[PDB]
Amino acid sequence: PIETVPVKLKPGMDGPKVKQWPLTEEKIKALVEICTEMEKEGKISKIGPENPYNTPVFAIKKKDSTKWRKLVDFRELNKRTQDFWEVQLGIPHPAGLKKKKSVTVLDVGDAYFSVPLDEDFRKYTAFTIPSINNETPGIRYQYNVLPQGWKGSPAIFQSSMTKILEPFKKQNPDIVIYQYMDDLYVGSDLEIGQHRTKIEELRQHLLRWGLTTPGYELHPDKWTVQPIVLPEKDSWTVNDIQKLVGKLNWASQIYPGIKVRQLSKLLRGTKALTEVIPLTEEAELELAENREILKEPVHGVYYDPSKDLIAEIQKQGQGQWTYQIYQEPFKNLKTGKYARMRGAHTNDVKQLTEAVQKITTESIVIWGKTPKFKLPIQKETWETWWTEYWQATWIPEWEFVNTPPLVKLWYQ
Amino acid sequence: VPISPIETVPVKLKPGMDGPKVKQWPLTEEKIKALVEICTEMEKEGKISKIGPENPYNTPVFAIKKKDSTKWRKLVDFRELNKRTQDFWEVQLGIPHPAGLKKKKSVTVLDVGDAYFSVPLDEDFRKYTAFTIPSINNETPGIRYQYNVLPQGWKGSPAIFQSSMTKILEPFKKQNPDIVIYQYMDDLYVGSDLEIGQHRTKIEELRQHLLRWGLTTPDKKHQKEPPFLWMGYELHPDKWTVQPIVLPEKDSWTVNDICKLVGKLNWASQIYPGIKVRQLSKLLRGTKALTEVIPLTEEAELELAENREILKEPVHGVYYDPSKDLIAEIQKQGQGQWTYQIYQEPFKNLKTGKYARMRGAHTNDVKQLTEAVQKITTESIVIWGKTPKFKLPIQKETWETWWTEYWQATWIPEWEFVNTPPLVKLWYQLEKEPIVGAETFYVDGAANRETKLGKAGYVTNKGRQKVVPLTNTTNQKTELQAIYLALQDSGLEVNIVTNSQYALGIIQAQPDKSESELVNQIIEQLIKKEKVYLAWVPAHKGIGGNEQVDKLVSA
RNA sequence: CGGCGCCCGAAACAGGGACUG
DNA sequence: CAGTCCCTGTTCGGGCGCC
Numbered sequence A: 001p002i003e004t005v006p007v008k009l010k011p012g013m014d015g016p017k018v019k020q021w022p023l024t025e026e027k028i029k030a031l032v033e034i035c036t037e038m039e040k041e042g043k044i045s046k047i048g049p050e051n052p053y054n055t056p057v058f059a060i061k062k063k064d065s066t067k068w069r070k071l072v073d074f075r076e077l078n079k080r081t082q083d084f085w086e087v088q089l090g091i092p093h094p095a096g097l098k099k100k101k102s103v104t105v106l107d108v109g110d111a112y113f114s115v116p117l118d119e120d121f122r123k124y125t126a127f128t129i130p131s132i133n134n135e136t137p138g139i140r141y142q143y144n145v146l147p148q149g150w151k152g153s154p155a156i157f158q159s160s161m162t163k164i165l166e167p168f169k170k171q172n173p174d175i176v177i178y179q180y181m182d183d184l185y186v187g188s189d190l191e192i193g194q195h196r197t198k199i200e201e202l203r204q205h206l207l208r209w210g211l212t213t214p215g216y217e218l219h220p221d222k223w224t225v226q227p228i229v230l231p232e233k234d235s236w237t238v239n240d241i242q243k244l245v246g247k248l249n250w251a252s253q254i255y256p257g258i259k260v261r262q263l264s265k266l267l268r269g270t271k272a273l274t275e276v277i278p279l280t281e282e283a284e285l286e287l288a289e290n291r292e293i294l295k296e297p298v299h300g301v302y303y304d305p306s307k308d309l310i311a312e313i314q315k316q317g318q319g320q321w322t323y324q325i326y327q328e329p330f331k332n333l334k335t336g337k338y339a340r341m342r343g344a345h346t347n348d349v350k351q352l353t354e355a356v357q358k359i360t361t362e363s364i365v366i367w368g369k370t371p372k373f374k375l376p377i378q379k380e381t382w383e384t385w386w387t388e389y390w391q392a393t394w395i396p397e398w399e400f401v402n403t404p405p406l407v408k409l410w411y412q
Numbered sequence B: 001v002p003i004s005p006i007e008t009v010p011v012k013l014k015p016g017m018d019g020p021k022v023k024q025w026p027l028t029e030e031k032i033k034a035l036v037e038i039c040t041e042m043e044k045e046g047k048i049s050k051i052g053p054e055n056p057y058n059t060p061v062f063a064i065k066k067k068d069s070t071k072w073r074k075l076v077d078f079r080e081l082n083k084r085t086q087d088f089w090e091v092q093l094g095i096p097h098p099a100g101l102k103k104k105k106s107v108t109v110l111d112v113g114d115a116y117f118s119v120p121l122d123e124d125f126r127k128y129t130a131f132t133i134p135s136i137n138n139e140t141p142g143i144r145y146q147y148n149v150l151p152q153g154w155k156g157s158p159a160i161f162q163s164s165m166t167k168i169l170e171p172f173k174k175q176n177p178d179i180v181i182y183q184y185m186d187d188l189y190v191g192s193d194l195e196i197g198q199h200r201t202k203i204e205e206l207r208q209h210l211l212r213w214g215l216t217t218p219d220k221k222h223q224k225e226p227p228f229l230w231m232g233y234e235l236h237p238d239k240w241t242v243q244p245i246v247l248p249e250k251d252s253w254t255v256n257d258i259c260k261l262v263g264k265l266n267w268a269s270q271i272y273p274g275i276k277v278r279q280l281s282k283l284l285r286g287t288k289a290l291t292e293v294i295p296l297t298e299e300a301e302l303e304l305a306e307n308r309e310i311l312k313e314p315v316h317g318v319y320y321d322p323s324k325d326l327i328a329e330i331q332k333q334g335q336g337q338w339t340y341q342i343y344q345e346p347f348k349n350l351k352t353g354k355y356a357r358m359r360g361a362h363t364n365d366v367k368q369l370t371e372a373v374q375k376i377t378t379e380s381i382v383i384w385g386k387t388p389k390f391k392l393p394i395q396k397e398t399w400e401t402w403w404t405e406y407w408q409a410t411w412i413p414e415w416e417f418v419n420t421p422p423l424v425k426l427w428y429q430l431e432k433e434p435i436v437g438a439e440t441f442y443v444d445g446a447a448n449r450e451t452k453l454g455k456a457g458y459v460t461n462k463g464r465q466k467v468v469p470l471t472n473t474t475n476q477k478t479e480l481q482a483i484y485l486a487l488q489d490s491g492l493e494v495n496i497v498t499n500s501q502y503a504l505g506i507i508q509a510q511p512d513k514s515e516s517e518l519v520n521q522i523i524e525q526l527i528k529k530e531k532v533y534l535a536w537v538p539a540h541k542g543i544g545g546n547e548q549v550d551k552l553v554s555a
Numbered sequence C: 001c002g003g004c005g006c007c008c009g010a011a012a013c014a015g016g017g018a019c020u021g
Numbered sequence D: 001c002a003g004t005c006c007c008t009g010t011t012c013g014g015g016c017g018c019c
């Protein structure tokens, strides 16, 4: 018996009608045991064929957790509620959250089930629990309360949240708190000991206000940027000078002051790839002068809030992956490298799933926005397995790309 | 007052729209005199009504005919009402595959009579139903009425039936955790591991529960008829099989024959192992008429032969035993065709299938296997809800070499080796580093956009040159073409410098087969070499003998 | 007429390369 | 800066097979 903030699909578009993808018996079980319980609690309740809307759902275990979390893919709804969240209520992004020596991510999504949801909107939370082999038809529900993972839910709960938090924020003014969907990012420069204590401390503030919380730590001050680097060579084979020249030629789309002229001239005749040609000083100095232009920043690269972020990931082999975040080509906001992620040396799809998450996470701590991925994978492979390795409560946007490697040169 | 059977399902109209008024369209003149009476039947049973002022509604009739009836079946067309009616979430997501059913001791089928007419239409929507169709021919202008139930040919009927039916069964199931029901249309199939007679206890005890909601189930029903014939299948509680296949022996082959043909082989492929469609499928390329005349090649018939002998003997599938693991084994049938069997106990199969689909202009066996393994995982998750243990014709070292080199993210789940030639191999590898003491062929090609004319050639560190004129070509083919030369004219180890990002993208993915004869030849040369290092440089940077081979061919 | 599987086509869509002064 | 082509892959459309 409290008010309910009405919600509307931005003009012209209908509710999400998207199909439920097949689930494992494992996961279908977890949803059944999860939904019957959420029904008993009147969080969701059964629905009929008069409601022709569907959003996909599946289940996950969070990292280092043996407990099953339900997950709805509200991506399509969030696109169709979008004007509502972006234009109506803004959430200021702390530029310092990224500078903190430690940042913990707490899962607060459960609190959202407190607030009721506007009855006219509920027909848009429809999701099917599928059956193995189509033996039964689907068990269909819709959300009565604020659904986890919808973009309106953290918005409408914005007010209620800011309330419960003000004591801690007031008592601890030096601690930074951000909220992105079902997740709460909390970070501080306190030594981890007093930090972990302050997080438990933060846990009570919401624990006693009626919330549950199923390590979480990040270390943003330590986040490194992978700069472009030309190899260190004693003696150069023709092939070396060439791979070098080509790479430099690529880099110059990014850094315009690059010149290949004297390094280029070194290759003049028709010579064996493996013959060793010595570096003239005039080129040797141009190359080293090039190595310089490559420790710098790039004129006019800055984050622009209105534009979407784009992330490109490359498989470098032997467990390594490189990525780049940018909103416009060749103007990169961050570049990096990953190695020895889970699955390294055994499962590429696992590693990339891991990769997409680590990238999405930094993307949220830094600009407070999830990127759109260009995934180096065939559609169906990713689409078939990505759901097994997924440990996150959000779902970034992605498209599939194939590039035979000339862009691999991000890493030696 | 009429009476009230079972819970009603709210139905709206696409906002800002209202019921139809329509003129009739042709239907046969004979069968239509019977309903003039039949409508009068329904008034009393509760399936019809009427009101004078309130209906601005009229609807026509258009039909489709059916074989195998001992009585004729009436119909009405709401098509105008349909398009104006809200959409529903369809209840039939497709049908279960036989191989996914768990084995059940007892299995019966009850057929629901008055199935569509046993379901109440929504009170407030009833109005939109009013309709008229010719008496015998016709005489005086007419009369009209409204529908109290689910109308034949209405958009919401199957959906609302299906959902309602489900709602009814729900309380029975909870009181009977170990019974198993499945609903297809108006037929229910029930089954149990209970003892044979006590199972029949619950069959009546359920016909009770259905009637209690007004759902009629006669005893012409058969427990003794199984196998039941449902959608091409024959189902016995212990084992299943496809319904009998008729292979055309026709001497005259038109492209529509081969089509009907293929679909049958492919449909056969779920159970009979080793069906191959490749060569029969070649005929279909770039044909104008489905009625066109096409000949059978020797290959396609030799295959069709091998295929005909597989169908000779009968075969049956088993059911799934959740206690035991799933096993999937793939054999390479060559020409990018694959067959697989999925079983649990050895030599007793749940199902079979083929994967023949050739994906991309240039590909290889590792890729194609990877694809099949993926087709199979998906099919397995749909059907058993788990991924099989894979048995594969590929050395764990073959595979490790591919996926770890390939630029794409790629994976096969937990899987083991089966040594069952042909074994899958990689036919060549490119060196990762320059080859000492190999000739270095610098290659380029160029063609002219207007004349479609060009030349492909090379220069080497040894002084050896070549330029070949080529007609009716493209800029790309000359770049492929120069590499081809450089392979031919080189020894067993060779380095090649190309400036074609295009050419490089292809060769580096180590294709073993191509649509393009030129790539096939490159491949064939590639397999013969001992060591090949293929490198790329930017064009027109004044590089190497790259500038030199550029002058030779752009000239 | 819809669902699933499939075979083909590319009339179309998208991505990337290359030339045109 | 825009407009020609060349090449490849992914939507879609056709038409079978099972309803």
Ligand SMILES: Cc1ccnc2c1NC(=O)c1cccnc1N2C1CC1
Pocket: B096, B101, B102, B103, B104, B107, B180, B181, B182, B189, B190, B191, B192, B228, B230, B235, B236, B237, B238
């Ligand atoms: C046609 C059909 C479709 C889906 N499931 C079943 C059936 N009918 C059966 O013949 C059947 C056979 C064996 C085991 N389950 C069966 N059943 C389940 C109900 C016990």
Ligand SMILES: [Ca+2]
Pocket: B444, B445, B446, B499, B539, B550, B554
């Ligand atoms: Ca050239």
